[PDB]
Design a protein around this ligand. Structure first.
Ligand SMILES: Nc1ncnc2c1ncn2[C@@H]1O[C@H](COP(=O)(O)O)[C@@H](O)[C@H]1O
Length: 516
């Protein structure tokens, strides 16, 4: 298998907007591969990615300057990036020349697109899940599960094509390979949560921060953000910290990383994300923004997989496994059968100033990548939305050098390409708009007058007065007065709220009419 076949797939997919046609084309291409080509390989090329989001390997490039088989090209990619040492900085022109001499002007567009991540190919991860489970005739539930436990497409692809149902089912946790976050639905009040949970429950402060995941093996700690970027290199001090306070040698834990004031109180999560960016030099930053990490779960310890263990037990273990500093702590909990002290905790947590409560079903096992009623948020406010900036619209006059308005998409399982759920102009300052304009400019996949269709890689969090059903957008959904809250860089396109999400928040809302 070579790059011409994959190019032919890129073209086949170029022509259509239509879901199962794309599914069928990809799936066909995957069916077309025997695996020295292994498909460690391909799936990320199909996605247009190079390496998994969690890889810690980065090579990108002065692409206008460098401008004068498949296994060959993955090889090229590992051998450019990994390649850790001093003799090459720019370089890579000869590295990129090594393959390029026999490469067609046909393919070059896709090579460079892959390079700068300038590939716009419309394949969603769910569409690829469908594509794998088709091509290799496996239950998609399984490609689902194994993806949720690993977040390695290549891995689930090989296991699928070789071992099938079988092996996929048997697939388990691997350190340094991120497990997808189990997620919460919403609750009205405490007493309610207490009802759904069947009379008793865990309660936790819901902290305002970045959900992170920590993988400890020996003296090597890996820490991941919600968008599964490897944030280790950026937060060295929470590296050293998490080494010492974690008792086991092979662990995987989950927690909330909160920027705090020295008061011991949380700053807005926007700062913690500043810390991930590593804009300045970490010497300065580590003092300018201190961070505490409050662990709420244990996915793995000591060659043991905790997924299938109830909450109650996982919690006891978690407490057992960590001996806490002021810099690392097991997230504050209360297990009670009565709502009084519950809402006492709710208030204590509010006046502590983060978000709300979490309410954990005690007997709940862990379901990676699943919002459910096993976990439940309790907040003063209505949940905000993280959605992709789908399109935008410029300003006029002096503001013609500015994108003022932002077309916002959500994701639809029977579509793919991201249905629009609204447009948002309120909440931004000037520098906010210079930012968004400069940053979004590269991502424009269509230009109509002063309005623009964006290649949807950017997730912002916006609040809204009301959710209503409007088929003035495809979704039959719209937002009453959206406003910028922040851009969540710790979420990418596959992390953004779906349409069914909107549905559920709506349902909660009419229940907060009815229940009020
Ligand atoms: N102690 C906690 N336990 C669980 N989730 C938390 C906690 N503190 C903050 N959170 C947030 O709650 C979210 C629950 O999932 P969701 O709101 O669907 O993203 C997490 O992703 C975190 O951002």
């Amino acid at each position: 298998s070579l790059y011409k076949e994959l190019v032919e797939l890129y073209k086949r997919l170029e022509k259509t907007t239509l879901k199962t046609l794309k599914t069928k084309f990809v799936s066909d291409f995957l069916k077309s591969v025997e695996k020295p080509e292994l498909l460690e390989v391909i799936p990320y090329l199909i996605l247009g990615k190079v390496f998994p989001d969690w890889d810690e390997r980065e090579l990108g490039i002065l692409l206008i300057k460098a401008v004068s088989t498949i296994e060959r090209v993955y090889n090229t990619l590992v051998k450019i990036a990994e390649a850790s040492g001093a003799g090459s900085q720019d370089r890579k022109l000869k590295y990129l020349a090594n393959l390029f001499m026999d490469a067609s002007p046909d393919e070059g567009k896709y090579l460079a697109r892959t390079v700068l991540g300038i590939m716009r190919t419309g394949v969603a991860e769910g569409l690829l899940r469908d594509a794998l489970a088709d091509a290799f005739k496996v239950r998609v539930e399984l490609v689902e599960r194994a993806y949720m436990l690993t977040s390695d497409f290549g891995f689930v692809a090989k296991v699928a094509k070789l071992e099938g149902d079988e092996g996929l089912a048997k697939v388990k946790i691997q350190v340094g390979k991120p497990i997808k976050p189990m997620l919460a639905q919403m609750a009205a009040n405490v007493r309610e949560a207490l009802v759904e949970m069947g009379g008793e429950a865990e309660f936790e402060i819901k902290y305002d921060g970045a959900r992170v995941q920590v993988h400890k093996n020996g003296n090597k700690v890996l820490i991941y953000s919600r968008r599964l970027e490897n944030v280790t290199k950026s937060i060295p001090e929470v590296v050293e910290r998490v080494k010492e306070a974690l008792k086991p040698e092979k662990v995987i834990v989950e927690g909330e990383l909160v920027a705090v004031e020295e008061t011991g109180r949380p700053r807005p999560f926007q700062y913690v994300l500043r810390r991930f960016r590593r804009k300045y030099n970490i010497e300065e930053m580590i003092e300018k923004i201190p961070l505490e990490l409050n662990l709420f779960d244990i996915l793995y310890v000591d060659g043991q997989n905790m997924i299938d263990t109830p909450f109650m037990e996982r919690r006891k273990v978690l407490e057992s496994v960590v001996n806490s500093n002021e810099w690392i702590k097991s997230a504050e909990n209360l297990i009670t059968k009565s709502p009084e002290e519950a809402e006492a905790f709710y208030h204590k947590a509010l006046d502590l100033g983060h978000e709300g409560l979490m309410a954990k079903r005690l007997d709940s096992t862990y379901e990676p990548g699943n919002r459910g009623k096993k976990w439940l948020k309790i907040k003063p406010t209505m949940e905000n939305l993280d959605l992709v900036v789908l399109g935008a619209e410029w300003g006029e006059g002096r503001r013609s050098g500015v994108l003022s308005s932002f077309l916002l998409g959500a994701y639809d399982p029977v579509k793919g390409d991201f249905v629009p759920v609204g447009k948002v102009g309120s909440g931004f300052t000037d520098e906010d708009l210079v930012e968004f304009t400069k940053m979004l400019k590269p991502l424009i996949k269509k230009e109509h007058g002063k309005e623009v269709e964006l290649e949807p890689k950017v997730v912002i969090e916006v609040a809204y007065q009301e959710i209503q059903k409007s088929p003035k957008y495809e979704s039959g959904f719209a937002l009453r007065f959206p406003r910028y809250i922040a851009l969540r860089e710790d979420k990418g396109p596959e992390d953004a709220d779906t349409v069914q999400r909107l549905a559920e928040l709506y349902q909660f809302q009419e229940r907060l009419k009815g229940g009020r």
